Amino acid sequence: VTLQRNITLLNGVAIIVGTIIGSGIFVTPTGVLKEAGSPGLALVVWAACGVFSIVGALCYAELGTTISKSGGDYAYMLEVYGSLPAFLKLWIELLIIRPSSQYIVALVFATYLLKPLFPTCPVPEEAAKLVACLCVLLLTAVNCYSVKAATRVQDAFAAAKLLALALIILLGFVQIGKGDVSNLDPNFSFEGTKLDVGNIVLALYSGLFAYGGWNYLNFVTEEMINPYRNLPLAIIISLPIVTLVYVLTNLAYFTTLSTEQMLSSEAVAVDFGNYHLGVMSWIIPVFVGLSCFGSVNGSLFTSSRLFFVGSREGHLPSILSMIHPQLLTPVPSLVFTCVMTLLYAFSKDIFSVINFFSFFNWLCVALAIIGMIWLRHRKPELERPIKVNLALPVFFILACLFLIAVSFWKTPVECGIGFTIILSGLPVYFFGVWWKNKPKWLLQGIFSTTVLCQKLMQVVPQET
Amino acid sequence: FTGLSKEELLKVAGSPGWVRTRWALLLLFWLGWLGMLAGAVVIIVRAPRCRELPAQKWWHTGALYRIGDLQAFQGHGAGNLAGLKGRLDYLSSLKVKGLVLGPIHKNQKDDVAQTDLLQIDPNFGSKEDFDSLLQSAKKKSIRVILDLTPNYRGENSWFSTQVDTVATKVKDALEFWLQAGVDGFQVRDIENLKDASSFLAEWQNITKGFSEDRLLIAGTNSSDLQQILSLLESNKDLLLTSSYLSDSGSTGEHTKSLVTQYLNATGNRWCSWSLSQARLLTSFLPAQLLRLYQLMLFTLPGTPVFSYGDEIGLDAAALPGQPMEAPVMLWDESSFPDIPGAVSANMTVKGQSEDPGSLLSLFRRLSDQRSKERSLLHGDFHAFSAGPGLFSYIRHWDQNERFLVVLNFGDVGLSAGLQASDLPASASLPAKADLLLSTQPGREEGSPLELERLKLEPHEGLLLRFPYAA
Ligand SMILES: *[C@@H]1O[C@H](CO)[C@@H](O[C@@H]2O[C@H](CO)[C@@H](O)[C@H](O)[C@H]2NC(C)=O)[C@H](O)[C@H]1NC(C)=O
Numbered sequence: 002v003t004l005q006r007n008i009t010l011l012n013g014v015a016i017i018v019g020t021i022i023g024s025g026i027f028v029t030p031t032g033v034l035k036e037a038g039s040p041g042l043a044l045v046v047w048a049a050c051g052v053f054s055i056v057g058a059l060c061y062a063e064l065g066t067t068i069s070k071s072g073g074d075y076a077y078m079l080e081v082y083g084s085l086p087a088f089l090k091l092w093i094e095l096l097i098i099r100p101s102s103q104y105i106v107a108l109v110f111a112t113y114l115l116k117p118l119f120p121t122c123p124v125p126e127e128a129a130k131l132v133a134c135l136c137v138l139l140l141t142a143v144n145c146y147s148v149k150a151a152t153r154v155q156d157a158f159a160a161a162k163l164l165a166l167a168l169i170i171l172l173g174f175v176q177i178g179k180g181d182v183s184n185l186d187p188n189f190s191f192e193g194t195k196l197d198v199g200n201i202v203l204a205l206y207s208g209l210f211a212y213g214g215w216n217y218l219n220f221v222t223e224e225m226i227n228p229y230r231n232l233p234l235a236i237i238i239s240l241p242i243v244t245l246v247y248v249l250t251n252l253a254y255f256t257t258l259s260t261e262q263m264l265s266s267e268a269v270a271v272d273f274g275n276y277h278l279g280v281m282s283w284i285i286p287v288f289v290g291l292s293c294f295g296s297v298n299g300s301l302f303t304s305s306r307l308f309f310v311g312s313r314e315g316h317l318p319s320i321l322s323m324i325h326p327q328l329l330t331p332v333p334s335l336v337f338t339c340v341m342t343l344l345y346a347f348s349k350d351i352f353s354v355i356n357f358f359s360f361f362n363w364l365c366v367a368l369a370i371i372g373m374i375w376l377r378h379r380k381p382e383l384e385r386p387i388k389v390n391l392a393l394p395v396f397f398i399l400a401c402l403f404l405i406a407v408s409f410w411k412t413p414v415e416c417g418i419g420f421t422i423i424l425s426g427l428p429v430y431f432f433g434v435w436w437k438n439k440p441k442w443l444l445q446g447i448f449s450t451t452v453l454c455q456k457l458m459q460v461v462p463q464e465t
Numbered sequence: 466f467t468g469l470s471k472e473e474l475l476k477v478a479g480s481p482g483w484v485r486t487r488w489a490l491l492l493l494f495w496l497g498w499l500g501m502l503a504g505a506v507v508i509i510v511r512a513p514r515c516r517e518l519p520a521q522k523w524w525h526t527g528a529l530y531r532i533g534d535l536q537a538f539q540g541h542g543a544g545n546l547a548g549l550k551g552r553l554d555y556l557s558s559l560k561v562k563g564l565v566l567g568p569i570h571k572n573q574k575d576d577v578a579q580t581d582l583l584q585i586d587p588n589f590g591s592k593e594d595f596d597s598l599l600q601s602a603k604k605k606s607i608r609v610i611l612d613l614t615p616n617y618r619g620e621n622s623w624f625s626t627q628v629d630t631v632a633t634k635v636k637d638a639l640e641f642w643l644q645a646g647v648d649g650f651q652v653r654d655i656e657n658l659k660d661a662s663s664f665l666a667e668w669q670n671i672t673k674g675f676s677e678d679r680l681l682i683a684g685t686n687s688s689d690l691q692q693i694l695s696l697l698e699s700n701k702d703l704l705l706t707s708s709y710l711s712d713s714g715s716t717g718e719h720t721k722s723l724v725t726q727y728l729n730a731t732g733n734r735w736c737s738w739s740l741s742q743a744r745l746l747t748s749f750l751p752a753q754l755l756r757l758y759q760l761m762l763f764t765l766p767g768t769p770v771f772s773y774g775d776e777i778g779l780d781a782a783a784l785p786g787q788p789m790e791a792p793v794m795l796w797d798e799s800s801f802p803d804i805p806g807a808v809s810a811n812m813t814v815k816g817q818s819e820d821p822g823s824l825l826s827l828f829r830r831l832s833d834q835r836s837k838e839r840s841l842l843h844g845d846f847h848a849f850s851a852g853p854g855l856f857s858y859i860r861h862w863d864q865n866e867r868f869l870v871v872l873n874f875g876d877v878g879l880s881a882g883l884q885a886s887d888l889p890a891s892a893s894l895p896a897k898a899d900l901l902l903s904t905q906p907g908r909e910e911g912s913p914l915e916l917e918r919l920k921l922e923p924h925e926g927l928l929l930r931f932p933y934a935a
């Protein structure tokens with residue numbers, strides 16, 4: 002009663018694009034410009050983020066080819082280091098990191114979808130929250146209904162967002178070719194905080210956030226046809242296209258709007274559409290909303306698969322990782338992800354906090370590469386269809402420590418808080434995994450709850 | 466592993482009640498989703514809408530700069546006008562949206578025949594340099610306004626008896642300079658011109674017919690409100706500057722009455738706020754009131770107009786020998802080698818360029834706030850009563866960040882002594898608001914201060930800011 006083997010190369014490429022393209026391209030430019038000022042500095046920062054993401058994606062493709070198990074970035078650490086680090090990562094993964102990206106993307110989609118109705122006066126927040134909740138509910142419903150439908154939706158929305166970006170690039174090129182210049186030729190005029198590495202890493206945080214989701218295909222592996230050939234091919238097809246699209250869009254943005262008006266603005270896409278169209282200027286917010294819809298739909302699938310694979314190792318209750326007959330879908334995992342995502346609606350502005358815990362997020366990746374090189378060194382027996390030349394993982398980890406050292410040199414108390422949060426998973430781990438021969442009254446209670454959920458949702462244990 | 470197997474579930478969960486419960490739960494979920502969508506639609510429709518976009522012109526955005534004479538502005542070697550391109554960075558720092566340029570047409574004192582409105586004076590430069598200046602200004606996004614006073618050298622600016630010939634020549638120069646590429650026109654001493662109202666109406670009609678983004682500036686020395694209103698009978702899109710607001714030197718309530726009466730008579734139209742037509746700020750005010758007037762002019766609902774050198778508080782009485790009409794600009798400590806005298810940083814451009822408590826920094830901050838804020842751009846005006854010598858008003862457009870300005874014209878300290886008396890309920894002032902700046906250093910920034918017991922120092926200005934509320 003295995004799940005399926007249905008994801009093809011095109012489906013994986015579409016999933017990557019949809020996930021990688023969500024709302025960062027339409028929001029993070031303002032923050033990265035305020036934190037860099039010089040358009041050339043912003044462009045080179047985005048290029049550095051792109052090449053770093055390409056490096057990481059290649060290394061993760063190598064690792065996934067080596068270990069053909071579902072739920073990447075977590076199965077590898079479990080294989081290499083043991084049980085404690087894996088559960089320590091997963092405990093905060095299922096609380097903070099995962100049920101925050103979906104909510105933020107849904108909120109951005111809701112805000113941008115209602116922009117034409119309220120062009121000047123800001124939209125009410127309650128309506129945006131309701132629209133985001135409706136979007137999340139509909140997406141989790143369609144994901145639970147089937148797998149092929151989710152893939153078709155992902156491909157359709159990826160095509161839509163690619164067409165939108167192509168139209169933006171064409172408009173920018175037409176504006177450039179009309180015979181008008183800007184501060185692009187005399188760039189680097191201001192170049193502030195050139196020696197201040199704090200602002201540099203602050204801008205790099207937003208740049209890396211805009212590049213997030215590049216490793217989500219490793220979560221859904223063991224479910225795609227012929228992974229050994231399809232995975233690296235999909236990654237190398239997808240990543241450079243994303244980098245090129247991002248840099249071209251950033252270049253096309255500056256040719257229309259001045260630096261001061263970009264910094265003072267709040268919706269650069271809306272201003273670009275208004276300037277270049279005047280009438281029928283509502284297309285851009287609609288396309289942004291569609292892109293965000295596709296991104297959150299892509300993220301939910303990977304989150305559900307990650308929660309599915311983790312529960313098979315006993316780190317999660319046995320009610321999870323419990324497949325459904327007839328249609329093969331992990332209903333409890335999707336329901337849990339949806340209910341956890343909705344729980345963040347009872348919060349104030351969260352974007353300022355999204356940079357929190359990024360240090361640990363990029364730290365776990367570094368340990369994964371260390372585990373990969375450890376396995377490559379001390380275990381020269383596993384069959385490796387793909388082999389990557391050295392000093393590429395070395396450069397990746399060196400960049401990781403360079404990025405992690407600044408987070409300790411500056412804002413240290415804001416790291417110690419949060420670091421205390423990640424360490425708070427020790428008591429729950431010792432209560433739920435290490436502990437054995439617990440008092441029986443809990444045992445039949447959890448058994449009865451699991452049986453009740455079993456009967457209510459009519460699912461089957463993972464027999465095979 | 467911790468629950469029923471496949472066969473056990475198949476045997477147990479086969480009762481019709483269970484499938485009925487599942488069907489009911491699915492239906493309940495779908496109707497709940499539909500109800501949530503309906504509630505979202507209801508909350509969308511029952512909400513106030515955005516007000517409007519006034520679609521203001523280019524000159525509604527920022528202040529205007531009156532260069533006037535060129536020799537005094539750039540000191541020695543200022544004959545060539547192309548040298549003003551090296552000063553454009555200073556204007557960009559001042560972020561002014563316009564530039565009133567002095568008369569350049571040929572004029573030999575009162576010789577009407579020897580007065581061409583198309584001939585550029587050789588000492589000023591040539592046509593090619595003028596075109597280069599226009600191109601550089603367009604690249605820097607600064608418009609150019611050129612003055613066409615028929616007699617900028619003689620005592621009578623309108624050539625005395627000659628009225629028809631000068632009218633025809635300036636009428637031709639209208640189209641000539643409009644096709645040359647100018648962005649607006651300015652005339653002065655209209656009060657010394659016979660039946661000039663028809664002339665201004667015709668010139669405004671021609672300028673508007675040529676293009677929609679053009680301007681026409683008029684200047685008179687009449688401070689009579691009735692005379693100004695009469696001059697605006699046949700024209701409503703004309704910017705007129707006069708000495709109406711100047712020559713008062715009295716309490717703040719007098720200025721409040723003057724401004725309120727002008728707004729009431731005009732009808733809340735667009736106006737120009739300037740002390741005079743060609744005079745400096747220091748020509749009518751003491752050194753202790755320059756900052757207060759600078760703060761007041763940048764917040765009134767209109768287009769502020771300043772003369773050259775008044776952003777640094779230049780004074781003509783000091784450094785004697787400089788004519789009051791065209792005092793020399795004090796760029797740096799060596800900007801006036803011809804006349805030795807007082808040299809210090811308090812009165813030099815580069816000297817005040819780094820001082821945070823200098824006039825130039827306050828001018829730059831006020832210009833940025835005026836040019837970047839929607840409420841200061843095209844907001845509303847509402848003035849309420851205050852203490853004996855206090856001027857207070859608020860600005861608010863639709864829903865953006867509101868602004869509150871309080872000025873103390875008195876020379877003694879006093880409490881706020883203010884009441885709400887606010888007509889717009891949506892603009893009602895709360896008890897908490899932030900502070901932006903004050904003319905007298907010694908106060909903090911960004912602290913939410915109670916709007917009830919404000920203590921005002923002599924000659925003090927405030928910039929209270931509070932967010933939109935219900
Ligand atoms: C001024 O221009 C307008 C439009 O080209 C014309 O007159 C306007 O419309 C009526 C009809 O003549 C007048 O009563 C208005 O006063 C004019 N509008 C203005 C002056 O703003 C006509 O071509 C021109 N008229 C004159 C007297 O110059």
Ligand SMILES: *[C@@H]1O[C@H](CO)[C@@H](O[C@@H]2O[C@H](CO)[C@@H](O)[C@H](O)[C@H]2NC(C)=O)[C@H](O)[C@H]1NC(C)=O
Binds near residue numbers: 686
């Ligand atoms: C502008 O200043 C001049 C200079 O005093 C004054 O103009 C006077 O106008 C009256 C009639 O309008 C005439 O007697 C003379 O033209 C001027 N009187 C003089 C020179 O004694 C007046 O102060 C101002 N002009 C105005 C307000 O129209």
Ligand SMILES: *[C@@H]1O[C@H](CO)[C@@H](O[C@@H]2O[C@H](CO)[C@@H](O)[C@H](O)[C@H]2NC(C)=O)[C@H](O)[C@H]1NC(C)=O
Binds near residue numbers: 729730
């Ligand atoms: C000038 O006087 C008042 C000052 O505002 C103008 O407005 C009048 O006063 C009340 C109370 O402030 C306003 O609410 C009304 O708009 C006006 N009341 C009337 C006209 O009865 C007034 O319009 C002006 N008087 C004029 C132009 O003759």
Ligand SMILES: *[C@@H]1O[C@H](CO)[C@@H](O[C@@H]2O[C@H](CO)[C@@H](O)[C@H](O)[C@H]2NC(C)=O)[C@H](O)[C@H]1NC(C)=O
Binds near residue numbers: 809811812
């Ligand atoms: C800078 O500002 C003015 C000129 O820009 C000057 O003010 C002097 O202040 C001293 C003491 O406060 C007094 O003697 C007079 O008020 C001014 N003296 C002179 C000679 O102008 C002065 O140059 C500077 N102000 C200072 C130092 O406070």
Ligand SMILES: CC(C)C[C@H](N)C(=O)O
Binds near residue numbers: 021210211212213296
């Ligand atoms: C981490 C991901 C949710 C970010 C995604 N690429 C977006 O910009 O929407």
